[PDB]
């Protein structure tokens, strides 16, 4: 019911509504995958002409303008279609935007530097490492930084960023958010992202897109950024009168050592890793965070006996472990069902707590006939997370499980990790680059500091407060608690609370409504 903006094919996905871009404003778009976020951006960018639900018909620009006349969006579209707007679009699929890239990072950026901001962006996005590398040879994260950089250098009216936090480490995400905020004043900016802290930093306004993945999406009205993210956490949109999730994502709610490790040293070629002694309690979640190339995965690999430490040990030396590696690939002949059944009797019995909380809530129950090699990154991720979690263990290690996940699935996963760990009185280490995930479920954290590729030093497990304080300080940002949802809120650099908390040394504030 309502007015269809676009439909790709008969009986296919349909989109209802569009957000209006606003000048001198950063507009966030948020929702689970498969609901039309990328479609919305491509419409806004002028790459797709809305067909108003008829994929047979070739709608012209004139027709689109007649259909919008009187409405909020008309004027944007008039300017778009009358070629009065220069549009920059940092596309979602960065790996596809790679095979048309000739030359080094420096020379690509030098070619397109229209705003004389090359050197500025180099600094802001910390690109000196990438500087004389071939665009062709770049990893996910280097490509993402190169395209975001390239977008910042362009002189344009509208800048569109589809998921710029993908492949970025915790530090890079924050730098990218600072860079966009700083360099794109007095422009139309639209951003889609699944990292809530990135969105919170970047956005003035927020639209939620909700619906059923691959069936339909509807765009909410514009909310003030803070409110929009809060309604998303509550899972309720007041204006639309819409329960978009049956439960809420709540922050800040309310003995024996199961394992202990000495100082751990590991040298790999050039890179030296040092990890401080520590211990973990039964039921406890230790988040691990730090930039990439710093030894987090090496540390994971030491804990699972894949790599031997050069000095130091973990007691007890042999325990039942369950491991979700960072690098995920289809390595199995059989179905999702066969793979899950192999892992646990629980995982697929409609009878257990697991099936409904994890399996079903991950929507893995819909992929049972699929064989593992058919699955997308997102689906393999959930499959490996679910399998890992279904196994009865003393120790769980999950490496970057939020990669490939949308904004909903990461919190469903987060919740599950907590549930399994506490249920089974186990230790869980989770490495992740989404800071809200840590805030949401980590009981203590380990911070990795140093120089990517050369040296990493990791602290013992400390309180979120103790670790975040030191981590945020280096990163030069301050966090407070939102009054309504208790979610972390990042003070925009320069802001009222930002310089005061900075003087106090209170970078990670546990105070409500700061
Ligand atoms: N060219 C297309 N033809 C048919 N279906 C498409 C096409 N492009 C996207 N879709 C579908 O529309 C839905 C919404 O996709 P998209 O806008 O990319 O979602 P999101 O960005 O929110 O993940 C998904 O079903 C997607 O596969
Ligand atoms: N087997 C290895 N041999 C030599 N160097 C390695 C090996 N495995 C990882 N490295 C290097 O060690 C550093 C630490 O990597 P890793 O533990 O993968 O970091 P993170 O998970 O923090 O990104 C990286 O620079 C990586 O290239
Ligand atoms: Mg998309
Ligand atoms: Mg890693």
Layout of SSEs?
Layout: E1 4-7, E2 14-16, E3 25-30, H1 37-44, H2 61-68, H3 74-81, E4 87-90, H4 105-112, H5 118-124, H6 140-153, E5 158-162, H7 170-183, E6 188-192, H8 196-202, E7 205-212, E8 216-219, E9 223-224, H9 225-234, E10 236-237, E11 242-243, E12 257-261, E13 264-268, E14 271-275, E15 278-281, E16 285-289, H10 296-303, E17 314-315, E18 321-324, H11 336-343, H12 353-359, H13 377-390, E19 395-399, H14 407-423, E20 427-431, H15 435-441, E21 444-451, E22 455-458, E23 462-463, H16 464-475, E24 478-481, E25 488-491, H17 496-504, E26 508-512
Parallel strand pairs: 2-8, 3-6, 3-7, 4-5, 5-6, 14-22, 16-20, 16-21, 18-19, 19-20, 24-26
Antiparallel strand pairs: 1-2, 7-8, 7-9, 10-11, 12-15, 12-17, 13-14, 21-22, 21-23, 24-25
The protein binds adenosine-5'-diphosphate (ADP) (2 copies) and magnesium ion (2 copies).
PDB class: hydrolase, translation
Keywords: ATP binding cassette protein, hydrolase, translation
Assembly: monomeric
How would you characterize the overall build of this protein?
The chain has 514 residues and is of the alpha/beta class. It folds into 2 domains: 1-252, Rossmann fold (3-Layer(aba) Sandwich), CATH 3.40.50.300; 253-510, 3-Layer(aba) Sandwich (Rossmann fold). Helices cover 32% and strands 22% of the residues. Strands 1, 2, 3, 4, 5, 6, 7, 8 and 9 form a 9-stranded mixed sheet that branches. Strands 13, 14, 16, 18, 19, 20, 21, 22 and 23 form a 9-stranded mixed sheet that branches. Strands 15-12-17 form a 3-stranded antiparallel sheet, with no helix packed on it. The longest helix is centred in the last third of the chain and has 17 residues, at 407-423. The radius of gyration is 23 Å and the shape is globular. The two termini are 42 Å apart. The structure holds adenosine-5'-diphosphate (ADP) (2 copies) and magnesium ion (2 copies). The site of one magnesium ion (MG) has 4 residues, from helix 1. The PDB classes it as hydrolase, translation.
